[model samples]
Structure formats: structure tokens, C-alpha cells
Target: SMSVKKPKRDDSKDLALCSMILTEMETHEDAWPFLLPVNLKLVPGYKKVIKKPMDFSTIREKLSSGQYPNLETFALDVRLVFDNCETFNEDDSDIGRAGHNMRKYFEKKWTDTFK
Candidate 1:
């Protein structure tokens, strides 16, 4: 028989770092597309196309509410925002380019911070 193990990974430091990273991302020049949830009226078929719509604001809410269990989970959620963008927009388009840039910036930050 196995017993429920006590949760050992508080990940407070990782969460704090996530907050810092999020602030930078929010201020990024190319962050406009990802700042908030996509408007259904603005982008027709968006909700249907994006099954798991992710955005910076939602990530912020999750961070503030302590919804992430670890840094990896938080990181993946951030990636989802960009991934969703790429899936919706063409690579040559404005939104698409921004998403690419933002993803690059985030990857650098993530590696530098955790390294």
C-alpha cells in the first residue's frame, strides 16, 4: 500500500521569477497580440480554431492565484500563447512575426534566468 506523499515542491522562487519574466513580456513591443484573450468578434472562428486559448493576462491571473505547480508548467503555458498565435496567423503577417519574436525573447530569458 502506498500513502499520499506530502508536496515538497513549493516552487516559491520559481513563481517569483515567473512574475518578473511576465512583467518584461507584458512590456515587450511585440506583445500586443498576446496581452489579452482574443476577441471572438474581432477574429471570427478563433475560438473554434484555438481549443486552448492562452494569453498573457490569463497567465498573470494563474500566477497571482498560485495555479501553477512548477516553473515548467508555467513555462509551457507561456509557450502556448505563442503557439496559439502561430497556429492562427501566417508567419509573414504582423501578429505572426510578433509571436515569433516574443517566443525568441522568452526562450532567452528562460534559459538565462534558470541557467
Candidate 2:
């Protein structure tokens, strides 16, 4: 028998990601998630939250600006963020396969740009 693949539902997490991505697209803020914890005190009180899209975008910016000292460092940083999402592979995760997709997206982008 051929099995069926069901689509993921739009839950709160997915909605939040979309909203954050949209907002960040408009702002283009010079912010990165990993550096956020260190600079929380510097940013305004209400702007301390770090969303996944911005996190992903910041990685892109980091790569483009030669922020990482080496390729392994860049991949390691990306893995730390995306790989740590414990629920990413759950059958009914609110975020769907976000972590997997992010890794795939970054690897492709990284290779295409560098090669």
C-alpha cells in the first residue's frame, strides 16, 4: 500500500515564525540571536525576543560579512541553534520540521555561495 503524507497544521509556533519573519523583513535589524543574550541590556526593554527567522537571517548575514573565522565554526554555530530544538522531530511538533528545513536551507545556500 502507498502511504499518505499528511500536512502540518498552522499552530501558534508556525504563526509566530511567520509574523517574526515578516516583521524582520521590514526592519532588517542588525541583530543575531547568539549575540542577543550578551546584548540584552543594550537593546530596549520590549525588543529582547529572538525569533527563528531572525536567527536564520543573522546566520546569513554572518556568513556574508565574514563573521566566522572558518567554515566549521559557521556550521557549528548553525547546528547549536537548529539542532537543539528538541521537539523538531516530534510527530506533532508545533514548529513542524523547522530545524531540518533550516539546516537544509543553510547548507545549500552556503555551498552555492562558496563554490
Candidate 3:
């Protein structure tokens, strides 16, 4: 007679790893649905998500009301999210596309602010 050993699945370890990865990934509360490259379509609804003229007062209000901590922090968070997407998948095209879209979004918003 022969005995066989069964492989064990540790739910706790899996949960821990999942939580750690989630925390490592930055969340852009301002950019709804566009958390990663897979979220390109989500970026087009910015007007719906934030239906108001973009201004410093808007930033201050959003921060005071805790929508975000501050402008610098928010920008850094977005950068982090974009940088994270750069390494999200093995295919460089997908990551490059995401970065391109993100750069376009940032440039449009930045130009609008000065204009």
C-alpha cells in the first residue's frame, strides 16, 4: 500500500499577499475608474465625475472636504499609479498605451489650468 500527501492551501497567506499588493498600488480618487491601463475608457467621463470648472478653489474645497489630502499629494498619487501601470503587465504595448493616455490627460488638464 502507498500513501499520498495532499497539497495545502493557506487562505491566510493569500489574503495577506492580496492586501499588501492592494496597498502598494496607489488609488487615484480624482481619476475615477482609470486606475490602470485597463481603465482607458473610464478617463473620458471626467466631466461627469467632476462636474465643475477646474480651479485652485476647487482643489482647496476638495482638500478641505477630504476628497483628497492636497494638490501635491494628489499629483504624486497619480504619478505613482501611472508608474505602477508601467509594470502592470508583461506586454509593453499595453503599458505604453496606458502611459500615453495618462500623459495626454495630464497635459490637457495642466494646460486648461493656465488658460
Candidate 4:
């Protein structure tokens, strides 16, 4: 439910927001972790299983290489994984909390950039 809020955009327009994400990714490459469609337990066995970006480097490569519709959607893809993931916690759960933090980060950026 919680997620980052990026500035609204539609090339010149998208440039600023997209650049911001790419800039952030330059530092926060491993922020978003995608869920795998299959069970890893079948292969080995573990308490938890997850999928990550194959490159594990620049998200800009994945986003631009995949040819996403625009920066807005790309931004959503990053923000939503944290929003929709099931990681509610009282003491120690980084997922939901990171989600909130990034949400605030972007809302601040949204005002700074879009307002």
C-alpha cells in the first residue's frame, strides 16, 4: 500500500524524472527485488525464496532496455514492488519501512520538482 511518489511526466518531460530514478539507481541498485513465479524449494529447499534482477546493476539498463512506456510507469514498477509486497512488521521489517521512506523521498521530490 505504501510506495514512492515520483513527479508526474509524459521526452523532455520524462527526462527529469527518469534521470532522477537513474541517478538514484546509480547508488541504490538493489532496492527492488522481484518475486519469482516458481518455487525454489523444488530445486533445493529453503524458508524463503525470491528472484532478483539478473544484471544486478543499473536498473536504467533494465528499464530502458525493456523499453517501458515511460518514466512514470518505470517509476511505478520500482515503487510498487515495495508497496505490494507482504512485509508488515512491528520491530524489524525493512520492506514496508523502506517503502514508506522512499514514498516520502519522492513526495518531497514531487513537490520540489513538480509543484
* Candidate of highest lDDT: 1
- Which stretches of model 3 miss by more than 4 angstroms? 1-67
Best by TM-score: 1
lDDT of 1 by residue, 12-89 (tens): 588788899999999999899899999988889897899999999999999999799889899999999988998989
**lDDT comparing candidate 4 with the true structure:** 0.50
Distance from true location, Cα of 59 in model 1, Å: 0.2
Off by over 4 Å in 1: 1-11
Please give each candidate's TM-score.
0.88, 0.38, 0.36, 0.48
Tens-digit lDDT track of model 4 for 28-115: 5334533232234564432243243222144456565756675566666555444444332232466555556555665576557656
**Candidate order (lDDT):** 1, 4, 2, 3
The digit string of per-residue lDDT tens for model 3 on 1-115 reads: 2577677544344333323323333242334324433333555653444322233333334444557533445454445545544444333565557555665566565455423
Better of 1 and 3 by lDDT: 1
The true-versus-predicted C-alpha distance at residue 105 of model 2, in Å, is 1.1
Tell me model 2's lDDT, rounded to 2 decimals: 0.46
As a whole number from 0 to 100, the lDDT of residue 32 in candidate 4 is: 53
Please give the distance, in angstroms, between residue 105's alpha carbon in candidate 4 and its true position after superposition.
1.1
Which is the better candidate, 1 or 3, if ranked by TM-score?
A: 1
In model 4, what is the error at residue 16, expressed in angstroms? 5.0
* Residue 28 lDDT (model 4): 55
lDDT of 3: 0.43
